[PDB]
């Protein structure tokens, strides 16, 4: 076999030939008997059973909590990934398989922050959603028993030329030169922190009113950024789905637009909404870019929902492809369908499971077999779609090590996108022989002190 | 390749002035080369930001520069039963500068303007304005092609057609070799963007101080549109000129519109009558394709080639993930009357958020091999994020795909090193063309001298 035809020198080089090779450290081994052979051939040659060095690649679980049936109740003791931790042991160029189960738990908490365009073009929409909070709470009650809702508003950067700056009356009332009154322009303002008291939503909304600016693209991306990274003010919960609903009827300003107002400083992705609940960097910091928005949305586990009107649906669908995980819904001209839009968006969100691998050592490669729908195995795939709340899927995974790395202890993570729970895989690389921990340096058996005796044979010591 | 990154030269302006936002080389009537620097936030008379210009003489040790003085006072003219008003607070004088012959043009894209008539008004809006100087003689002139005297109600009754109130003329600028100043006005025609051209000679001979509204008859403006593809396209964010139609008597215009067609972005090549010859569409929405443009023959055929910067391009990476890095596109001009094809070359940045392709500057022939070369800025690039400029050499097939040399920012974090660039001028008369790099965040400019090739 290849274990003998390789002519290895040490116990360590013998194991590094193939996962099926073994090594004999026994003193009473015959004349020309190869110490590197199959474990079956070694015992056949009277090798002492305790002298066999033959590691086996295994994989046992350390945490195997069962999948929770309900996400309701508990201080987030919910389990949706199983197992949670396993211990992996591998020898050179060997592989081992293991499994992971993921469940879309029933009755999981939901946060919904409604981020609304309040430019003058949206004047008729305010009247439509003045009972949205209670009606939304009635419908979402069927899916979750832990609902919190909240509200913010945006227009655009209150600076020329976006803003009307003459005559002095226009500053206090941008609708001066029409026969009405609207609010002074504002960039972004937080209104209602996420709460389970849904009549607070209705009553805040009934006090809101529109403003007015000059140009059709609006400053909504500013508000998305601040509603994402101002964790404490908005009130996102640690163990809940995060739904950011963005409603508008117009194009949007993007990064590098700001130079038309003399603003060149890049967006810094930090929170600049203080005790007055307005975005204070609106006149000094550029609109954020798609990449920066994607980074922060992903970091805070926020699901962005573009709820826009038909005239800009293609636009926001095209943006949606550049911000993975975003969903789009068609908003009517007055926001009168926004309730059902939010419900369908929530279903589409929890209809997918996608595995993600973090901190994978370079030596390790993984392969995946998926099982969605009804015990249907889909090789070479690590994501399921078309799911419903309550469904459970599973994946068959195989790790294949290449060589043996310098470090013998590494650990990586396998986590579904947007999920709290994860599978931690603690890897141990076993390419060493137990007899090496009891070697004889400068042994009397090896060239009269010029060598080291380990695992039955003589090795050339350090310095030669 | 052969720019010297060891012995640099530093010019510095006042703190907070944004010295280095724009720059250009300037020659006097004796051929002496200096550096004109825009500082769009220099303080003015009322201890208020108005911007300013500086004219830096060439000294190896650098240092401070004298001001190029322009009138910073707000103006009022009561005439024709109306009241005309200029507003220079936060106008951004020095947000663009360009030099042609012995004349310097320096623009304030955010100068505001208004007209009063009884109880009505035009509305106070940023028409922009440019200032012209002949330093050796002291002559001064101005050019503000978007000032009008129409009242707010007339625009409303006419459906906001031909509305030049938010032009921001001078946002970008360029001069033809014949002396025709071409101004980008990305806010023109209710944010479609327009171009304004007029001969420098006619700008001077028709200007007098105090008039505020005057005619430059030889001028020529671009046109409004009902096509929604142009709405909010910011046509005129950047401009350049070149030879692209084979006829040497005609000069062609290169115009960037980085949010054209629902933020797809575009670049257009036009004749001097603003007729569209070619259009190059962007690859990716919001990448700001058209942020910068550059014209130079890089492959030694004698035909001008085009480069387009898209600093917010997101590169596709593993696991279906995008990374904003920036991208530059190279289009070689084909033989005879033919349209520009797909790009010949794509250059893509490496550092996340580096904004590779934010500025592209022709260098001339840096290494003296017979092919013109270019420099590309990534003002937040480099492994430190402090900013990087990358040099690419021309060759018979276009450009080398890998940089010959990399200039790391000598300034601290946030200087925006490379936000403005300029090459192709030998400033020390050593026979090699040099490079100036602005870093307005640090209020400084760095001069890189080219030296003989080592290899």
């Amino acid at each position: 076999n290849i274990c003998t035809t390789r002519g290895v020198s040490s116990c360590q080089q013998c194991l590094a030939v193939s996962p099926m090779c073994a090594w004999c450290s026994d003193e009473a081994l015959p004349l020309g008997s190869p110490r590197c052979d199959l474990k079956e051939n070694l015992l056949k040659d009277n090798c002492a059973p305790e002298s066999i060095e033959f590691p086996v690649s295994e994989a046992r679980v350390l945490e195997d909590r069962p999948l929770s049936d309900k996400g309701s109740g508990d201080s987030s003791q919910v389990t949706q990934v199983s197992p949670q931790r396993i211990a992996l042991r591998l020898r050179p160029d060997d592989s081992k398989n293991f499994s992971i189960q993921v469940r879309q738990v029933e009755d999981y908490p939901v946060d919904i922050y409604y981020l609304m365009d309040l430019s003058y073009s949206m004047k008729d929409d305010l009247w439509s959603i003045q009972n949205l909070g209670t009606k939304l709470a009635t419908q979402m009650r069927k899916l979750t028993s832990n609902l919190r809702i909240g509200f913010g508003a945006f227009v655009d950067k209150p600076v020329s030329p976006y803003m009307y700056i003459s005559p002095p009356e226009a500053l206090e009332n941008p609708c001066y030169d029409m026969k009405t009154t609207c609010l002074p322009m504002f960039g972004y303002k937080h209104v209602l922190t996420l709460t389970d008291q849904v009549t607070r939503f209705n009553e805040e909304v009934k006090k809101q009113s529109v403003s007015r600016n000059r140009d059709a693209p609006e400053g909504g991306f500013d508000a998305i950024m601040q509603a994402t990274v101002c964790d404490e003010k908005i009130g996102w919960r640690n163990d809940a789905s995060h739904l950011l609903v963005f409603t508008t009827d117009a194009k949007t300003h993007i990064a590098l637009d700001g130079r038309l107002a003399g603003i060149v400083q890049p967006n810094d992705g930090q929170c600049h909404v203080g005790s007055d609940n307005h975005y204070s960097a609106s006149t000094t910091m550029d609109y954020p870019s798609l990449g920066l928005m994607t980074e922060k949305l992903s970091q805070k586990n926020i699901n962005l929902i573009f709820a826009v009107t038909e005239n800009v649906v293609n636009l926001y669908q095209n943006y949606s492809e550049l911000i993975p995980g975003t969903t789009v819904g068609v908003l009517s001209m007055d926001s009168s369908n926004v309730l059902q839009l939010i419900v369908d968006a929530y279903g589409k969100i929890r209809s997918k499971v996608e595995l993600e691998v973090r901190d994978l050592p370079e030596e390790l490669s993984l392969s995946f077999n998926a099982t969605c729908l009804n015990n249907e195995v889909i090789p070479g795939l690590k994501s399921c779609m078309g799911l419903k709340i309550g469904d459970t899927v599973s994946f068959s995974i195989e790790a294949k090590v290449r060589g043996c790395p310098q470090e013998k202890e590494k650990s990586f993570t396998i986590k579904p996108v947007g999920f709290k729970d994860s599978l931690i895989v603690q890897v141990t690389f076993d390419c060493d022989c137990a007899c090496q921990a009891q070697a004889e340096p400068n042994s009397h058996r090896c060239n009269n002190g010029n060598g080291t005796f380990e695992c039955g044979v003589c090795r050339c010591g350090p310095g030669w | 390749l052969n720019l010297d990154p060891v012995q640099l030269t530093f010019y510095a302006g006042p703190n907070g002035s944004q010295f280095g936002f724009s720059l250009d080389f300037h020659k006097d009537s004796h051929g002496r080369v200096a550096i004109v620097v825009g500082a769009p936030r220099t303080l003015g008379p009322s201890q208020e930001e108005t911007g300013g210009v500086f004219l830096c003489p060439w000294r190896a040790e650098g240092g401070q520069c004298p001001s190029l003085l322009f009138d910073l006072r707000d103006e009022t003219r009561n005439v024709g039963s109306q009241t005309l008003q200029t507003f220079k607070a936060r106008q951004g004088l020095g947000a663009s500068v360009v030099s042609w012959s012995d004349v310097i043009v320096a623009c304030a894209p955010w100068q505001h303007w208004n007209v009063l008539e009884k109880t009505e008004e035009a509305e106070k809006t940023p028409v922009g304005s440019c200032f012209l100087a002949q330093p050796e003689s002291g002559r001064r002139a101005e050019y503000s092609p978007c000032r009008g005297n129409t009242l707010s109600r007339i625009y409303v009754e006419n459906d906001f057609s031909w509305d030049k109130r938010y032009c921001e003329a001078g946002f970008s600028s360029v001069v033809t070799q014949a002396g025709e100043l071409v101004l980008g006005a990305p806010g023109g025609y209710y944010f479609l963007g327009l171009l304004a051209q007029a001969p420098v000679a006619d700008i001077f001979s028709s200007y007098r101080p105090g008039i505020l509204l005057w005619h430059v008859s030889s001028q020529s403006l671009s046109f409004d549109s009902s096509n929604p593809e142009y709405f909010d396209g910011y046509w005129g964010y950047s401009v350049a000129v070149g030879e692209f139609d084979g006829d040497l008597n005609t000069t062609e215009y290169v115009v960037g519109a980085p949010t054209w067609s629902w933020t797809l972005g575009a670049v257009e090549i036009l004749d001097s009558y603003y007729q569209r010859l070619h259009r190059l569409r962007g690859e990716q929405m919001a990448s700001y394709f058209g942020h910068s443009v550059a014209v130079t023959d890089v492959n030694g055929d004698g035909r001008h080639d085009l480069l387009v910067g898209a600093p917010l391009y997101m590169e596709s990476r593993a696991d279906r993930k995008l990374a904003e890095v920036g991208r530059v596109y190279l289009f070689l001009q084909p033989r005879g009357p033919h349209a520009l094809g797909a790009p010949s070359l794509l250059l893509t940045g490496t550092q996340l958020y580096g904004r590779f392709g934010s500025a592209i500057a022709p260098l001339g022939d840096l290494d003296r091999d017979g092919y013109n070369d270019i420099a590309v800025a990534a003002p937040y690039g480099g492994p430190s994020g402090r900013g990087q400029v990358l040099v690419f050499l021309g060759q018979s097939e276009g450009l080398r795909s890998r940089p010959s040399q990399v200039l790391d920012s000598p300034f601290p974090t946030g200087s925006a090193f490379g936000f403005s660039l300029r090459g192709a001028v030998d400033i020390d008369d050593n026979g090699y063309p040099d490079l100036i790099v602005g870093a307005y965040g640090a209020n400084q400019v760095a001069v890189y001298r080219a030296q003989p090739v080592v290899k």
């Binding site: 430019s119 655009d156 007015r212 000059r214 140009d215 | 906001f160 209710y190």
Partner: peptide, 5 residues
Amino acid sequence: RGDXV
């Protein structure tokens, strides 16, 4: 025109 007609 813009945020309106």
